[PDB]
Amino acid sequence: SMEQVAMELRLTELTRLLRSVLDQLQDKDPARIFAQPVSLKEVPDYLDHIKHPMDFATMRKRLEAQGYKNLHEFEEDFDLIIDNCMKYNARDTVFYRAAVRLRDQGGVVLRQARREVDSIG
């Protein structure tokens, strides 16, 4: 159906906008602290602590499979990156400190992306 194709064109366009958002958020992590999943070889107990791991690479795989239906879903995964880090690591650590900065810096990017998604439908 032509409806199914129009809905697909919207998913694709959302996917293009989210790829750009994702790039912008990841530039706010110049140390690549959140680039890849926490290693279970190196933190073998990690899943006893964190039930839903997240990282930018795993977001990116979901994104290119057009697995985000809306901004809310993408924001959920971004928030996991930050929240997981802020529970597992203590306040006085380079890791926690990097999440706070990502959170604060990403807030601006996310504010405008919400407006763009609303605006362009």
Swiss-Prot record:
Tissue expression: Highly expressed in testis.
Functional summary from the UniProt entry: Scaffold subunit of various histone acetyltransferase (HAT) complexes, such as the MOZ/MORF and HBO1 complexes, that acts as a regulator of hematopoiesis. Plays a key role in HBO1 complex by directing KAT7/HBO1 specificity towards histone H3 'Lys-14' acetylation (H3K14ac), thereby promoting erythroid differentiation.
First and last residue of the signal peptide: none
Covalent crosslink: Glycyl lysine isopeptide (Lys-Gly) (interchain with G-Cter in SUMO2): K41
Subunit annotation: Component of some HBO1 complex composed of KAT7/HBO1, MEAF6, ING4 and BRD1/BRPF2. Component of the MOZ/MORF complex composed at least of ING5, KAT6A, KAT6B, MEAF6 and one of BRPF1, BRD1/BRPF2 and BRPF3. Interacts (via PHD-type zinc finger domain) with unmodified histone H3. Interacts (via PWWP domain) with dimethylated and trimethylated 'Lys-79' on histone H3.
Protein name, UniProt field: Bromodomain-containing protein 1
The organism's place on the tree of life at top rank: Eukaryota
Annotated ranges, domain Bromo: 9-113
Parts of the chain that traverse the membrane: none
Cell compartment(s), UniProt: Nucleus; Chromosome
